[PDB]
Design a protein around this nucleic acid. Structure first.
Lengths: 77, 106, 98, 95, 86, 97, 87, 106, 95
DNA sequence: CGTTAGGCATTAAGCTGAACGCACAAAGGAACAAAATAAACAATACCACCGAAACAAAGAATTAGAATAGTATAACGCTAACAAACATAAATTAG
DNA sequence: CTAATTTATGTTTGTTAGCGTTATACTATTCTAATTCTTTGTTTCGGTGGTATTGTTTATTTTGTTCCTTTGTGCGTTCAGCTTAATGCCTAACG
């Protein structure tokens, strides 16, 4: 539709792969409770376990700035 | 030669008295000099709006005096003065004469 | 054979002449006696200015006339013309009185 | 040698002779106009005081009065009163 | 003989064809029979509130009589402002 | 099939929603309505989330007060339902028209 | 069947089940179908009043946003004070 | 050794803060020393009356916390606190559960 | 190093532990009690201010507060509050 | 009673860095919501009636008005003396 | 976890109760005038009950439709400390 999506951060791709993991190991679970548990586990992770995700998010940010260098956010009504 | 503050603004209400009432009325510690001029302006315009409708009511009734029946008529017949004075009742004023249409015969 | 009006026919003329006229409809002396009777129970031996009893009579007539307007609105709403005390209690209840 | 009742009785008559030269006024209607002037003065000054308190302003200027006029007076009365008021301060500041 | 006295049964002094005029000012076309005692009670509780407020107003001022200004303030505190007395 | 009587589910919802203290208006459409009306008075008016929550709570309170007065006026007229004339009467007697 | 979308009409978001819940909280056993549009108009004029007062509040302070205290002060003047959102 | 004004009256609310709010609240030019003590007394008694009924409501519901549903219940069930807080509505409070007797079946 | 919200949150909890030791309180109910304390303070101080103005008194003493308590609070709450208040000033003056 | 000329001390406009607040990326059933329908019970149209309220005339009984005298009371002015704002040193407390 | 916010002491000052006096409106009394409240006998009409038609709400199931709760990032808005001109209040004088 022409809409540029926001690039994924560390927690979104982490919760994406881990929610796909939980949905392939657990049936009959509501997704709000899944995301509550995923936020809980992400806040009990140490920072030593998160550098690949934040680095990958930084790669998406440099890909985004190299893909659109004259980009500026414009909120509309 | 010096000219009064009521006619400095070109008005009738005294700027000094509304200034004194704002001071001794205990609304703030200080009060701006534009405050009594603005307040006398909106006050003078407000009683001008009352007295113009009152005079049109009294001349409409073929009377030459403003009795408070004319003030009650001029206030209750209006729309945006009725919102300003909806809770206030008027001494010796009576009501706005209006009868519900189902009470009236056909 | 004397001539008689119908119920309601004289009532509209009375409604019109009382809406036109601006005087007080209850006498000043029973209102003086009732106000002095009521104000015993808060402090005995009070003197009432005539202007104070007149102001109480003005506000009293205004409050009862507004309450009877709302009573007629509620009685018309229930498809009646004869107002009833439940209409008074209802119009007091909606108004925030009780 | 009675002390004098400080009231707005003369200026309501001045406004009346400005707006309606032929019709007279009662005394009790003049008292009603005095009570109305004092009521509207209390409303506008109370809203100006609480607006200066809500913004932690120790000075009530014409802005608070203008905002209180826009708060209380409904309909076209608000903008008519604001135009009259700004005409008055432009008159008072031009002189 | 004695200035001191006591009053009783003054709510009948506001009479039934004097209630009917207050009703027919407000636009009422027919008034039932049981309206009168209820309206007298409504009047009684309203007067009791406003008179108690006026009595507390005049007793704060170390006074013995009830002016009209205190009745005006008592009606202002109930939210029914009276115009015409100062 | 065993369908309930008309109103018995309504009574259970009456007791359930009166025992409940939840907000009965969804937050996103009320946010859209508030930022749709308030543009007409001034443009570029963002709202704090507490402000639109306060507006939703006060409109909830004002409407349940209006609806208990409305049901009073409707019971008074020998009606179980609510018709808009009841809302008109409850707004008129309260002195809001 | 198919979903229907209408441009603008901000009053309409206040859905029909979310008004039936508001009346069930008020203790209403039956609601006719002509109530929802009238209640929408009532809510519209109520928000118009409170929003206009809060807009004048935040415009007097030259603030582009509408805080919670402005809505409290706007509701206080109509005789409906909010508890809980700070004084 | 000196003792606080809040416990000079034997209270919990601070006399100094209500004194400061009476001063900077702009209610008069002067304020009497008995005024904040009296005002803290009636205030402390008032929230004591609220919190006692709130605790009895929460203990009556077999809960151990005061949520505002308990405050709304304690205020709306009372008679002479309902006249004090009749116009005020309560955030996240709900209503007093009462259903009209004609809506209920027989 | 934020500036601190000046509020009555501790003293409502002190009164609660005086009157009900076992039950706890929420945070939003503590905010409701803070708003209620500020509302009642505004009501009583506004009536005391207008009473001192109606009698041309420049000083609000305990008499104006007592009269305003008898004005606002209905029923037995009035005399209970007055007895509590006079107990407080007799405590404050005896010490 | 109302207005006007110079200090001065308080106060709002001006400015910038910083901290707040809000939207939004995926998810993916949960929770909600719109729509179509059976029918069941509520609103309502109509009719009878009967006792309840309006209307009327008479008289009674009450209020209005006025002169007047006492008279508690309230509203004026001096005066003391008392209570509260203000300048300046602890302390506890609390977010 | 230590700045900050309430508390105490003496000084000035400006408010207020006590006192005197007096005016002034309030209360009571007794007359006439008038006017209006209450009684009693019509009379007629609206509230209320009872039944039948109808019209429309509710409860439900199906199928879309949205929402919700989670953290980091971007951007716009507000706010607080510091600068600085604006201004209003006080005094003395005048009319």
């Amino acid at each position: 539709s022409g809409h540029i999506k926001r690039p994924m951060n560390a927690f979104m791709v982490w919760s994406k792969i881990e929610r796909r993991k939980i949905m392939e190991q657990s049936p009959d679970m509501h997704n709000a409770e899944i995301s509550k548990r995923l936020g809980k586990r992400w806040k009990m992770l140490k920072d030593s376990e998160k550098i690949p995700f934040i680095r990958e998010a930084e790669r998406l940010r440099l890909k985004h700035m190299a893909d659109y260098p004259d980009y500026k956010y414009r909120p509309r009504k | 030669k010096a000219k009064t503050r009521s006619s400095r603004a070109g008005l009738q209400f005294p700027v000094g008295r509304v200034h004194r009432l704002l001071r001794k009325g205990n609304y703030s510690e200080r009060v701006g000099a534009g405050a009594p001029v603005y307040l006398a302006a909106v006050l003078e315009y407000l009683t001008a709006e009352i007295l113009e409708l009152a005079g049109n009511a009294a001349r409409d009734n073929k009377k030459t005096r403003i009795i408070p029946r004319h003030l009650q008529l001029a206030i209750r017949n209006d729309e945006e003065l009725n919102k300003l004075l909806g809770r206030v009742t008027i001494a010796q004023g009576g009501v706005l004469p209006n009868i519900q249409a189902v009470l009236l015969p056909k | 054979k004397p001539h008689r009006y119908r119920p309601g026919t004289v009532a509209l003329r009375e409604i019109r002449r009382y809406q036109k006229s601006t005087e007080l409809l209850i006498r000043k002396l029973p209102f003086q006696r009732l106000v002095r009777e009521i104000a015993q129970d808060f402090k005995t031996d009070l003197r009432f200015q005539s202007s104070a009893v007149m102001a109480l009579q003005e506000a009293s007539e205004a409050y009862l006339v507004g309450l009877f307007e709302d009573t007629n609105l509620a009685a018309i709403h229930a498809k009646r013309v004869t107002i009833m005390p439940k209409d008074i209690q209802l119009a007091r209840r909606i108004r925030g009185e009780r | 040698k009675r002390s004098r009742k400080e009231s707005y009785s003369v200026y309501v008559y001045k406004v009346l002779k400005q707006v309606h030269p032929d019709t007279g006024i009662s005394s009790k209607a003049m008292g009603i106009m005095n009570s109305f002037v004092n009521d509207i003065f209390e409303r506008i000054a109370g809203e100006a005081s609480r607006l200066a308190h809500y913004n932690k302003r120790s000075t009530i200027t014409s802005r608070e009065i203008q905002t209180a006029v826009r708060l209380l007076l409904p309909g076209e009365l608000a903008k008519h009163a604001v135009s009259e008021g700004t005409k008055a301060v432009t008159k008072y500041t031009s002189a | 003989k004695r200035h001191r006295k006591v009053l009783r049964d003054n709510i009948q002094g506001i009479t039934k064809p004097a209630i009917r005029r207050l009703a027919r000012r407000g636009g009422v076309k027919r008034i039932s029979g049981l309206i009168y005692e209820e309206t007298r009670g409504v009047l009684k509780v309203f007067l009791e509130n406003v008179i108690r407020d006026a009595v507390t107003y005049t007793e704060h001022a170390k006074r013995k009589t009830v002016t009209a200004m205190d009745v005006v303030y008592a009606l202002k505190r109930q939210g029914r402002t009276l115009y015409g007395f100062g």
